[PDB]
Amino acid sequence: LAAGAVILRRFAFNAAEQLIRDINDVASQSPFRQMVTPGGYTMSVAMTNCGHLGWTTHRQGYLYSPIDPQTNKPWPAMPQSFHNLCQRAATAAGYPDFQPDACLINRYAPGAKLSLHQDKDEPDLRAPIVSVSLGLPAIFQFGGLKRNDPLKRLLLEHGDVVVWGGESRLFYHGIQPLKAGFHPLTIDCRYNLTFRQAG
Numbered sequence: 001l002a003a004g005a006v007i008l009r010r011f012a013f014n015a016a017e018q019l020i021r022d023i024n025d026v027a028s029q030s031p032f033r034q035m036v037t038p039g040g041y042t043m044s045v046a047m048t049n050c051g052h053l054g055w056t057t058h059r060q061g062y063l064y065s066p067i068d069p070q071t072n073k074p075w076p077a078m079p080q081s082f083h084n085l086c087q088r089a090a091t092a093a094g095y096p097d098f099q100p101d102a103c104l105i106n107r108y109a110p111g112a113k114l115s116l117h118q119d120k121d122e123p124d125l126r127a128p129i130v131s132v133s134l135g136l137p138a139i140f141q142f143g144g145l146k147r148n149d150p151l152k153r154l155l156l157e158h159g160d161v162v163v164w165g166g167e168s169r170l171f172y173h174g175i176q177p178l179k180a181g182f183h184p185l186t187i188d189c190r191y192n193l194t195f196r197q198a199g
Ligand SMILES: O=C(O)C(=O)N[C@@H](CSCc1ccc2ccccc2c1)C(=O)O
Pocket: 104, 106, 114, 119, 129, 131, 140, 162, 164, 168, 169, 170, 171, 173, 174, 175, 192, 194
């Protein structure tokens, strides 16, 4: 399916309410914002981060920064719920040493999407990324190592966690425009957490 990826469906289902509380807490400090791409377009996905580092635009490029450029303060500390869930998932998937210092939190309103990309900016690409999906379902599309590799699609639903290791860590991937709907925990949106070793 995706070589090296370990899909754990509903792994975060029981933790989801706490996770969402923690997302709200994080956002009360560093608010969700829609970043501007180099190229000048406003992303449809809104973002924030927690942990020592967080992903952001700066100076018409992207990077991991210890300071949130919007507040000029550090990103909020990584919530225990986040840290512990990530560790359980990574450990089950065979990455017991994974120690994320960054968690990017993506929020999707109806229609929001994430264009096909690789995550290339972490210092060691042997370290996995761990995603946790919450709320409304989204169609995840994924390629291969080359931009033009044939795309496959799978639905990511509430509570689904995936550890993207091995070859899959390098795949081009994205999220297709979110279908509108209702979810009891998130109301009208989807959240996705991605845990990274950025330092
Ligand atoms: O944050 C990202 O970089 C990202 O692409 N997030 C999407 C997709 S989740 C699945 C996912 C996340 C990160 C990956 C990083 C490397 C390879 C495969 C990945 C798959 C989202 O917000 O739902």
